[PDB]
Amino acid sequence: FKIYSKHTPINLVRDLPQGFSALEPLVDLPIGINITRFQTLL
Amino acid sequence: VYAWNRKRISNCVADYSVLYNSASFSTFKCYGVSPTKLNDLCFTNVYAD
Amino acid sequence: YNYRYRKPFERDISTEIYQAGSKPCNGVEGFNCYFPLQSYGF
Ligand SMILES: *[C@@H]1O[C@H](CO)[C@@H](O[C@@H]2O[C@H](CO)[C@@H](O)[C@H](O)[C@H]2NC(C)=O)[C@H](O)[C@H]1NC(C)=O
């Protein structure tokens, strides 16, 4: 399991910003769990 | 064999030529590498399943 | 009796019965509902 990700303050907050960017490999987890589901948390 | 131990051997060094020479195993074989070469290897992990 | 069988590095804390016939076997043993966790002559 890998996370690529990128964080910034923004001007426009409810709908997606235009212009270019890329996400960077902040995580790798070679733990072998056979994921089929996910959920958001508070 | 269903609960098989996915032991992520990690953050470590070993000699594998001793394993290759060892009489402890009724079978020992290597596939992507020939078994004499193993002391020259390096890995992110070995999952000792 | 402690050694028994349930894919390419497939693993979970779960197991289920083989449909050895058309039957929905419910994990229950029978003719063409043969139990998956067969005992070994260790
Ligand atoms: C990850 O999980 C799935 C099930 O969620 C595995 O699917 C099994 O695959 C084998 C063939 O390799 C089938 O015969 C089984 O019937 C499948 N099981 C189930 C419950 O559907 C899948 O193989 C797993 N991934 C790996 C690489 O093992």
DSSP A1-42: -EEEE-----S--SSPPPS----EEEEE--------------
H-type alpha helices, C1-42 = none
What span, in angstroms and rounded, lies between the C-alpha atoms of C42 and C40?
A: 5
Give how far A33 is from chain B: nearest CA, Å: 10
List strand residue ranges (DSSP E) for chain C, in order. Answer: none
What span, in angstroms and rounded, lies between the C-alpha atoms of C42 and C35?
A: 18
The experimental technique behind this entry is cryo-EM
- The CB density around residue A14, as the number of other CB atoms within 10 Å, is 4
What span, in angstroms and rounded, lies between the C-alpha atoms of B6 and A37?
A: 22
- Give the distance from CA A18 to its chain's centroid: 17
Q: In residues, how long is chain C?
A: 42
Structure tokens at B36: 């004499």
Rg (CA), chain B: 12
Helix (H, G, I), strand (E, B) or coil at B40: helix
What span, in angstroms and rounded, lies between the C-alpha atoms of A1 and B20?
A: 32
CB contact under 8 A, A32 and C10: no
Nearest partner of A22 among A4, A41, A3, judged by Cα: A4
Distant-in-sequence, close-in-space partners of B1: CB < 8 Å, separation ≥ 6: C3, C4, C5, C6
- Chain B residues in contact with C5 by the CB 8 A cut-off are 1-2
Atom of ligand 1 nearest to the CA of A36: 5
- The CB density around residue C35, as the number of other CB atoms within 10 Å, is 15
Ligand 1 center to C10 CA (angstroms): 6
CB contact under 8 A, C11 and B1: no
B19's enclosing H/E stretch is helix B17-21
Give how far A1 is from chain B: nearest CA, Å: 14
